[PDB]
Amino acid sequence: MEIQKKLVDPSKYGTKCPYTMKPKYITVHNTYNDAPAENEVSYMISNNNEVSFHIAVDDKKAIQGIPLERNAWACGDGNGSGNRQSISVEICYSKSGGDRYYKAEDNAVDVVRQLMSMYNIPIENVRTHQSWSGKYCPHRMLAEGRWGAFIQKVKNGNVATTSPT
Ligand SMILES: [Zn+2]
């Protein structure tokens, strides 16, 4: 999966990621609304709002907006774990639920494994927004029992042993 780079401006760092920290975990979220990942990033990096994320992936494209060598306020967990040292991945089109979501999820898989490989994050550190504080973000994944599946998919790169064929 190809990641786009339109990372946030240094002047916006201290509203999206004022601190610098190395990510040890990964936090996956599902989108409650449908939009291309590029839309989410363009919006998020320019926001004044506390909540930020690193990489957004949709069915079409994957775009990263917050530098991974910095924090991301995502969980509202303050200084606990993910807000400080996790990678926030936002799956776009989760609201759309259908084909756009299925690709977006599959695309996140490929993206997420890269972080596990590069930053040395075990699949055991991939957590939900609820796993830190309790905001239900991966709604689709949690409700349909697709979280564990996603996690196994990320483990290898989509075609891990979790899809019976
Ligand atoms: Zn969230």
Side-chain angles (χ1 to χ4, degrees), residues 27-30 32 51-53 74-76 88-90 128-130 135-138:
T27 307
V28 183
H29 315 238
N30 286 149
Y32 56 84
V51 181
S52 312
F53 64 77
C75 183
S88 300
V89 181
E90 191 66 65
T128 74
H129 189 153
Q130 178 181 145
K135 178 176 299 299
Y136 197 61
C137 274

mmCIF file of all heavy atoms in Angstrom, residues 27-30 32 51-53 74-76 88-90 128-130 135-138, ligand 1:
data_model
loop_
_atom_site.group_PDB
_atom_site.id
_atom_site.type_symbol
_atom_site.label_atom_id
_atom_site.label_comp_id
_atom_site.label_asym_id
_atom_site.label_seq_id
_atom_site.Cartn_x
_atom_site.Cartn_y
_atom_site.Cartn_z
ATOM 1 N N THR A 27 -2.754 2.313 17.480
ATOM 2 C CA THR A 27 -4.150 2.429 17.811
ATOM 3 C C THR A 27 -4.983 2.541 16.521
ATOM 4 O O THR A 27 -4.828 3.500 15.751
ATOM 5 C CB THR A 27 -4.383 3.679 18.692
ATOM 6 O OG1 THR A 27 -3.496 3.642 19.823
ATOM 7 C CG2 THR A 27 -5.821 3.722 19.198
ATOM 8 N N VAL A 28 -5.850 1.572 16.291
ATOM 9 C CA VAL A 28 -6.686 1.531 15.090
ATOM 10 C C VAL A 28 -8.088 2.106 15.396
ATOM 11 O O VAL A 28 -8.650 1.863 16.481
ATOM 12 C CB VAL A 28 -6.817 0.078 14.575
ATOM 13 C CG1 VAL A 28 -7.619 0.020 13.283
ATOM 14 C CG2 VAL A 28 -5.442 -0.531 14.378
ATOM 15 N N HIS A 29 -8.627 2.897 14.474
ATOM 16 C CA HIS A 29 -9.951 3.510 14.644
ATOM 17 C C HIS A 29 -10.720 3.306 13.334
ATOM 18 O O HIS A 29 -10.106 3.202 12.273
ATOM 19 C CB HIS A 29 -9.850 5.068 14.891
ATOM 20 C CG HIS A 29 -8.802 5.534 15.894
ATOM 21 N ND1 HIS A 29 -9.050 6.308 17.072
ATOM 22 C CD2 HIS A 29 -7.460 5.365 15.850
ATOM 23 C CE1 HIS A 29 -7.856 6.541 17.617
ATOM 24 N NE2 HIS A 29 -6.910 5.986 16.914
ATOM 25 N N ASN A 30 -12.025 3.235 13.412
ATOM 26 C CA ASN A 30 -12.877 3.170 12.219
ATOM 27 C C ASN A 30 -13.556 4.498 12.060
ATOM 28 O O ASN A 30 -13.856 5.162 13.057
ATOM 29 C CB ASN A 30 -13.971 2.073 12.301
ATOM 30 C CG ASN A 30 -13.507 0.626 12.136
ATOM 31 O OD1 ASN A 30 -14.100 -0.289 12.721
ATOM 32 N ND2 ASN A 30 -12.526 0.386 11.307
ATOM 33 N N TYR A 32 -16.535 6.984 11.431
ATOM 34 C CA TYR A 32 -17.969 7.055 11.633
ATOM 35 C C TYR A 32 -18.619 7.744 10.446
ATOM 36 O O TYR A 32 -19.839 7.769 10.313
ATOM 37 C CB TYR A 32 -18.302 7.799 12.950
ATOM 38 C CG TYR A 32 -17.713 9.201 13.050
ATOM 39 C CD1 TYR A 32 -18.362 10.302 12.491
ATOM 40 C CD2 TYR A 32 -16.506 9.417 13.702
ATOM 41 C CE1 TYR A 32 -17.819 11.569 12.578
ATOM 42 C CE2 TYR A 32 -15.959 10.682 13.792
ATOM 43 C CZ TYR A 32 -16.620 11.752 13.228
ATOM 44 O OH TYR A 32 -16.072 13.013 13.315
ATOM 45 N N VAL A 51 -7.589 16.352 18.823
ATOM 46 C CA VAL A 51 -7.413 15.034 18.268
ATOM 47 C C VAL A 51 -6.702 15.064 16.928
ATOM 48 O O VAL A 51 -7.050 15.823 16.011
ATOM 49 C CB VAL A 51 -8.770 14.287 18.143
ATOM 50 C CG1 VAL A 51 -8.584 12.887 17.568
ATOM 51 C CG2 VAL A 51 -9.451 14.213 19.500
ATOM 52 N N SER A 52 -5.717 14.220 16.853
ATOM 53 C CA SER A 52 -4.872 14.025 15.726
ATOM 54 C C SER A 52 -4.751 12.510 15.473
ATOM 55 O O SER A 52 -5.268 11.703 16.249
ATOM 56 C CB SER A 52 -3.499 14.558 16.103
ATOM 57 O OG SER A 52 -3.611 15.836 16.691
ATOM 58 N N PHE A 53 -4.096 12.140 14.403
ATOM 59 C CA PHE A 53 -3.795 10.757 14.106
ATOM 60 C C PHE A 53 -2.599 10.750 13.177
ATOM 61 O O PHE A 53 -2.285 11.774 12.605
ATOM 62 C CB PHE A 53 -5.001 10.010 13.463
ATOM 63 C CG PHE A 53 -5.435 10.536 12.122
ATOM 64 C CD1 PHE A 53 -4.708 10.231 10.993
ATOM 65 C CD2 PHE A 53 -6.561 11.324 11.994
ATOM 66 C CE1 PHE A 53 -5.071 10.694 9.775
ATOM 67 C CE2 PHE A 53 -6.942 11.798 10.754
ATOM 68 C CZ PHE A 53 -6.197 11.482 9.642
ATOM 69 N N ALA A 74 -4.975 11.059 20.245
ATOM 70 C CA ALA A 74 -6.038 10.352 19.586
ATOM 71 C C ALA A 74 -7.030 9.802 20.547
ATOM 72 O O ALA A 74 -8.222 9.957 20.376
ATOM 73 C CB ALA A 74 -5.485 9.248 18.713
ATOM 74 N N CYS A 75 -6.538 9.177 21.577
ATOM 75 C CA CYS A 75 -7.385 8.475 22.474
ATOM 76 C C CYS A 75 -7.998 9.372 23.534
ATOM 77 O O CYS A 75 -9.025 9.031 24.107
ATOM 78 C CB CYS A 75 -6.641 7.327 23.145
ATOM 79 S SG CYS A 75 -7.704 6.353 24.221
ATOM 80 N N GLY A 76 -7.394 10.500 23.784
ATOM 81 C CA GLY A 76 -7.848 11.320 24.892
ATOM 82 C C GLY A 76 -7.418 10.675 26.185
ATOM 83 O O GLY A 76 -8.063 10.803 27.224
ATOM 84 N N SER A 88 -1.549 6.281 15.509
ATOM 85 C CA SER A 88 -2.950 6.298 15.295
ATOM 86 C C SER A 88 -3.270 6.081 13.829
ATOM 87 O O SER A 88 -2.862 6.871 12.965
ATOM 88 C CB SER A 88 -3.513 7.601 15.803
ATOM 89 O OG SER A 88 -3.253 7.730 17.189
ATOM 90 N N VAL A 89 -3.981 5.010 13.561
ATOM 91 C CA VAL A 89 -4.385 4.652 12.224
ATOM 92 C C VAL A 89 -5.890 4.783 12.121
ATOM 93 O O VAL A 89 -6.631 4.227 12.942
ATOM 94 C CB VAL A 89 -3.952 3.198 11.867
ATOM 95 C CG1 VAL A 89 -4.365 2.833 10.443
ATOM 96 C CG2 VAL A 89 -2.448 3.026 12.045
ATOM 97 N N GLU A 90 -6.332 5.519 11.156
ATOM 98 C CA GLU A 90 -7.738 5.774 10.964
ATOM 99 C C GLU A 90 -8.185 5.056 9.676
ATOM 100 O O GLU A 90 -7.645 5.330 8.588
ATOM 101 C CB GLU A 90 -7.920 7.299 10.829
ATOM 102 C CG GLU A 90 -9.348 7.818 10.889
ATOM 103 C CD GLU A 90 -9.998 7.621 12.248
ATOM 104 O OE1 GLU A 90 -9.523 8.233 13.246
ATOM 105 O OE2 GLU A 90 -11.004 6.914 12.337
ATOM 106 N N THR A 128 -7.287 -0.748 20.357
ATOM 107 C CA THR A 128 -8.358 0.058 19.870
ATOM 108 C C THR A 128 -8.365 1.362 20.674
ATOM 109 O O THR A 128 -7.640 1.496 21.664
ATOM 110 C CB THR A 128 -9.748 -0.638 20.073
ATOM 111 O OG1 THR A 128 -10.119 -0.600 21.438
ATOM 112 C CG2 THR A 128 -9.708 -2.093 19.651
ATOM 113 N N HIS A 129 -9.192 2.306 20.272
ATOM 114 C CA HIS A 129 -9.351 3.548 21.030
ATOM 115 C C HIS A 129 -10.048 3.206 22.372
ATOM 116 O O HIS A 129 -9.881 3.889 23.390
ATOM 117 C CB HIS A 129 -10.200 4.544 20.201
ATOM 118 C CG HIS A 129 -10.293 5.970 20.745
ATOM 119 N ND1 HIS A 129 -10.506 7.077 19.951
ATOM 120 C CD2 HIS A 129 -10.246 6.451 22.005
ATOM 121 C CE1 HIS A 129 -10.590 8.158 20.697
ATOM 122 N NE2 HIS A 129 -10.437 7.796 21.951
ATOM 123 N N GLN A 130 -10.802 2.129 22.363
ATOM 124 C CA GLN A 130 -11.498 1.690 23.535
ATOM 125 C C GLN A 130 -10.543 0.980 24.494
ATOM 126 O O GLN A 130 -10.707 1.030 25.708
ATOM 127 C CB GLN A 130 -12.688 0.799 23.166
ATOM 128 C CG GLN A 130 -13.434 0.279 24.378
ATOM 129 C CD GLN A 130 -14.573 -0.605 24.060
ATOM 130 O OE1 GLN A 130 -14.858 -1.546 24.787
ATOM 131 N NE2 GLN A 130 -15.312 -0.228 23.102
ATOM 132 N N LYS A 135 -13.354 4.757 24.062
ATOM 133 C CA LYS A 135 -14.167 5.295 22.992
ATOM 134 C C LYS A 135 -14.237 4.283 21.886
ATOM 135 O O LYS A 135 -13.198 3.809 21.389
ATOM 136 C CB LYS A 135 -13.658 6.633 22.469
ATOM 137 C CG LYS A 135 -14.488 7.186 21.315
ATOM 138 C CD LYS A 135 -14.019 8.569 20.878
ATOM 139 C CE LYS A 135 -14.114 9.618 21.984
ATOM 140 N NZ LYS A 135 -15.496 9.825 22.463
ATOM 141 N N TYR A 136 -15.430 3.936 21.513
ATOM 142 C CA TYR A 136 -15.657 2.934 20.539
ATOM 143 C C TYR A 136 -15.362 3.509 19.153
ATOM 144 O O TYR A 136 -16.159 4.236 18.580
ATOM 145 C CB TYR A 136 -17.126 2.500 20.665
ATOM 146 C CG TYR A 136 -17.519 1.189 20.036
ATOM 147 C CD1 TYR A 136 -16.945 0.003 20.459
ATOM 148 C CD2 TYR A 136 -18.490 1.131 19.049
ATOM 149 C CE1 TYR A 136 -17.330 -1.208 19.903
ATOM 150 C CE2 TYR A 136 -18.879 -0.072 18.501
ATOM 151 C CZ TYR A 136 -18.295 -1.235 18.927
ATOM 152 O OH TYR A 136 -18.684 -2.438 18.375
ATOM 153 N N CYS A 137 -14.173 3.237 18.680
ATOM 154 C CA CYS A 137 -13.772 3.619 17.321
ATOM 155 C C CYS A 137 -13.862 2.528 16.299
ATOM 156 O O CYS A 137 -14.542 2.706 15.307
ATOM 157 C CB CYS A 137 -12.467 4.398 17.222
ATOM 158 S SG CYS A 137 -12.725 6.124 17.453
ATOM 159 N N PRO A 138 -13.178 1.379 16.477
ATOM 160 C CA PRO A 138 -13.297 0.272 15.530
ATOM 161 C C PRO A 138 -14.642 -0.457 15.705
ATOM 162 O O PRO A 138 -14.688 -1.663 15.886
ATOM 163 C CB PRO A 138 -12.123 -0.630 15.903
ATOM 164 C CG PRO A 138 -11.903 -0.382 17.333
ATOM 165 C CD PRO A 138 -12.231 1.059 17.569
HETATM 166 ZN ZN ZN B 1 -10.706 7.152 17.949
#
